[PDB]
Amino acid sequence: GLMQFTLPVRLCKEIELFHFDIGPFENMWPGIFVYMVHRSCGTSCFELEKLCRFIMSVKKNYRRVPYHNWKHAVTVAHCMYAILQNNHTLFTDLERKGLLIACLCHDLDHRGFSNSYLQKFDHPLAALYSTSTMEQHHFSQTVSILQLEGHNIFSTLSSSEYEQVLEIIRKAIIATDLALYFGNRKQLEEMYQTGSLNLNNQSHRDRVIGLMMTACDLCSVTKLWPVTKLTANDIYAEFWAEGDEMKKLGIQPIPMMDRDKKDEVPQGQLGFYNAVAIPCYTTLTQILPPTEPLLKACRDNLSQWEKVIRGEE
Ligand SMILES: Cc1ncc(C)n2nc(CCc3nc(N4CC[C@@H](F)C4)nn3C)nc12
Ligand SMILES: [Mg+2]
Ligand SMILES: [Zn+2]
């Protein structure tokens, strides 16, 4: 009850910044997550014993894949923490509760393959979930873990607050399907420019939380350049393995997943920053001005990829 998680001084200060890297010590990640729940939500939000059991079962249900792993989950939850702490008064107690959980859970049981590869392989998940295949799976794994004995961190909520939090988590997880982001961001851009954007409209908040989810999920592009560049290596290690698997099915992968296009990576990152990342953090900064450091760090990393192309790095 009188028990506070604390961090060494460098971590206690840097965890508050958007560009924080959670580090290579796996055994500190649970503590880092509880620290963030306690400060964004309160020591009162969850029973510590239930929360600890939930976190450890979530970790066990992430796989040892190069990118979509337990480190990615905690990284995406820290970006959410930074958004919530810089926009204190914009969010309900249930949103604060749900969104860090949604972030920790958003890629549960990922196998390192895209929705498109499950559909071409004809994986059973592709017949159970026709669109947002993995993202419906991640939400289904989150519910499974919440129903294990001693793992219901939400047991203090009413039937209706419980139904609301699971609905916030479901939408937040579904929104991490990047196929859905493009249309979400265009609707948000238009609503903001014509001044129709209204945070009392539930379906507007839903879209804003959707964009916050894309922003957290993409947050590797908002780190210090060596973090950005080394994470890119993990991202391609997956994509290229998927490319190999496409060739095994007799299918030319897209360029992004073809390891023979290794040399064009600097240019693929440019398209990605211009087509996806920069527009994501721009719209986010218009709607939530204190998230600007994410846009500023993304722009810095774009000009680092530009330098790689010019042969200056
Ligand atoms: C940093 C980051 N965070 C999240 C995600 C989902 N992604 N996806 C990419 C891939 C970006 C990309 N690379 C390529 N190619 C073309 C052939 C070669 F040049 C590589 N095309 N594209 C679009 N990087 C990220
Ligand atoms: Mg995902
Ligand atoms: Zn993710």
From Swiss-Prot:
Its recorded name reads: cAMP and cAMP-inhibited cGMP 3',5'-cyclic phosphodiesterase 10A
- Where 3',5'-cyclic AMP binds, per the record, is at H68, Q269
Q: What family is reported?
A: Belongs to the cyclic nucleotide phosphodiesterase family.
**Which residues are the active-site ones?**
H68
Tissues where the protein occurs: Abundant in the putamen and caudate nucleus regions of brain and testis, moderately expressed in the thyroid gland, pituitary gland, thalamus and cerebellum.
Q: Which residues form the PDEase domain?
A: 1-312
Sites where the protein binds 3',5'-cyclic GMP: H68, Q269
- Give the recorded effect for D107N: Reduces activity 1000-fold
- Domain note for this entry? The tandem GAF domains bind cAMP, and regulate enzyme activity. The binding of cAMP stimulates enzyme activity.
Positions annotated to bind a divalent metal cation 1 = H72, H106, D107, D217
The positions annotated for binding a divalent metal cation 2 are D107
Q: Disease linkage in the record?
A: Dyskinesia, limb and orofacial, infantile-onset: An autosomal recessive, early-onset hyperkinetic movement disorder characterized by axial hypotonia, dyskinesia of the limbs and trunk, orofacial dyskinesia, drooling, and dysarthria. The severity of the hyperkinesis is variable. Striatal degeneration, autosomal dominant 2: An autosomal dominant disorder characterized by striatal degeneration and dysfunction of basal ganglia, resulting in hyperkinesis.
What subcellular locations does the record give? Cytoplasm, Cytosol
Function text? Plays a role in signal transduction by regulating the intracellular concentration of cyclic nucleotides. Can hydrolyze both cAMP and cGMP, but has higher affinity for cAMP and is more efficient with cAMP as substrate. May play a critical role in regulating cAMP and cGMP levels in the striatum, a region of the brain that contributes to the control of movement and cognition.
Q: What lineage is on file?
A: Eukaryota, Metazoa, Chordata, Craniata, Vertebrata
Describe, as the record does, how this protein assembles with itself and its partners: Homodimer.
